[PDB]
A paper describes a structure:
To improve structural details in the RBD-8D3 interaction interface, we further focus-refined the relatively dynamic RBD-1-8D3 Fab region and obtained a map of this region with enhanced local resolution, revealing side chain densities in the interaction interface and the substituted L452R and T478K. The 8D3 Fab binds on the tip of RBD-1, with the CDRs of 8D3 forming a pocket wrapping around the RBM loop region including the substituted K478, while the other substituted R452 is not involved in the interaction. Moreover, our Delta RBD-1-8D3 structure revealed that the loop exhibits a conformational variation relative to that in the RBD-1-ACE2 structure. Particularly, an obvious side chain orientation alternation (~ 6.9 Å) of the substituted K478 was observed. It appears that all the CDRs, except CDRL2, of the 8D3 Fab are involved in the interaction with the loop. Here, the N92 of CDRL3 forms a H-bond with the substituted K478 from loop, leading to the K478 side-chain orientation change, which breaks the original K478-N487 H-bond within the loop, resulting in an observable loop conformational change in Delta RBD-1-8D3. According to our Delta RBD-1-8D3 Fab structure, N501, K417, and L452 are not located in the interaction interface between 8D3 Fab and RBD; while E484, although residing within the loop, remains distant from forming contact with the 8D3 Fab, thus explaining the observed potent neutralization of these variants by 8D3.
The spike (S) protein of SARS-CoV-2 is a glycoprotein that forms trimers protruding from the virion surface and mediates viral entry into cells.
Residue numbers in the entry:
A (entry chain B): 1 to 211
B (entry chain A): 1 to 220
C (entry chain E): 333 to 526
Write the structure that this text describes.
Amino acid sequence: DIVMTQSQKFMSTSVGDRVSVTCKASQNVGTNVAWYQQKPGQSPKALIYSTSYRYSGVPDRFTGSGSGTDFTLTISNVQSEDLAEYFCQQYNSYPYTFGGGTKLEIKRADAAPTVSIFPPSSEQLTSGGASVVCFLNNFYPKDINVKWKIDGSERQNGVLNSWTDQDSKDSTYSMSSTLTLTKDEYERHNSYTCEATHKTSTSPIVKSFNR
Amino acid sequence: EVQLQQSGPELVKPGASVKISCKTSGYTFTEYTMYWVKQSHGKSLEWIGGINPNIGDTSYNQNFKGKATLTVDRSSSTAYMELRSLTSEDSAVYYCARDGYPYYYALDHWGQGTSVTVSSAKTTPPSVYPLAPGSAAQTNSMVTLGCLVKGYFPEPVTVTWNSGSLSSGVHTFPAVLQSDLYTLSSSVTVPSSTWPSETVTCNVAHPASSTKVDKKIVPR
Amino acid sequence: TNLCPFGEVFNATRFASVYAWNRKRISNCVADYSVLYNSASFSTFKCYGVSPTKLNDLCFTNVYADSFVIRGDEVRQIAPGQTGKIADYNYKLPDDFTGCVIAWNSNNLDSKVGGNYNYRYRLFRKSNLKPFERDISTEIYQAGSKPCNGVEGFNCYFPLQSYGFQPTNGVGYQPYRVVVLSFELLHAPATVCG
């Protein structure tokens, strides 16, 4: 079937700026393509059909051009309601092949994360297992790499992560790292550190604790 | 007013079958074609098939041929999608649509979405666990706290700090899976002028088990 | 004296379908409308505008004969101001239609074994039809938003559909022959009169 490729997946434009969302097709789709808008959690709504016409209730700033291979959904004056998930569809041959999706973001200044490690409490010590967490709050941009080192040895099993969406007040990210292990494996070593690198510094941000 | 209302979220075991409805009102149900889609978490969208109410012609995707069938009830204007042989890969939301060709459109006009999850676990109440900052003055400017949950089902829980009064920097991270049971954490920023002089607690509640548990953050 | 050939369109051997209904105008003869009503072989002899017994005196300048075969439960749709899938996509009568319609059952000639799939009607169409207009076409009706290139698949179908004119069907599913007589009166003097 048709492979609708979107590149890239992330884009960052501030308010009052021009943004262009593009997606390609594999075969000759013709003219009949579409574009949609999906708020986080809500249902997707339709924006542009047949790459030249809007819908009933959508703003007039959502314009589209292109035919054959390249299609572009250009927005002139973006707003806070423009932040959504945008997809592209085809209507040429069954089955219908949706696109990949592109999420919009707000541009911000560069800020280093404020890392914080929390050792397991005494209620964890009498439960059956242990888990040490490493919070990372208020950083920009989204790219980051956390690395749990156990006395100088990088641990890979049981290292789970959970990123967040962008905060609607300061446009900063947050993420957490959960390292799960058993009792005697926690008291087998003596130190634990939460290495996290970023583009805001050459050397990574170091934090650790003992025992 | 044209309105599409779907069903509620269904918890289902693997291997079973469900029926997802999409009631229709505000337009002529017979002429317009109804589609069905599927959106997995974090990945791209995918199309399943479409059914025509006046005739009954169907054309499913080739990856969903032995997965979903479609039936239309013209006596109540309600369509149905019946999923078969469910596995852990069907943790997705499912929408209903509506074609728009006799109005000079290419419209789909998506509905609400039914969150259908798959698991083999009984509903287990959560167990909160505090986080040690720890003792004092780490750091000297702003100290962060937190409270974990571990082993609960299903989503969601309502994590409120100080019974819903402290909201200056609450970061409830989304839930992940480590042992076929959800877990998450929360991160707050309390200034040094109130901690550890005043009591800052973490209130996690579960609507699926009706259990209210609170744990006070103790400096250790 | 030359009588009008109204028995030619009535006692014919090959009638037409409802999407390609035949039509020829009768002129320059004296009409004999008395033996049509007094034939005792018709089912529904109703008029619309003219009294059915007052045909032999008040005459018209041209008559039309539209002959086509429809079902038993759809002969009511050929009437001024009615809806249905036959009345709007195959043959429509206006409000000012001042003629008489006449129908009869034709089970003993258009019902054989195997099923008569020659009589075809139009089920799908883009919009409704203007009064007294036919549309011979085999264009694929695009029902959904997929532009198909004259092929048969999903969301675009063939507009014609055959009839189940089998003799074992019910009395409402038998094929019925109906002729539409449209008496049109111009400001010119009449020609068929008597």
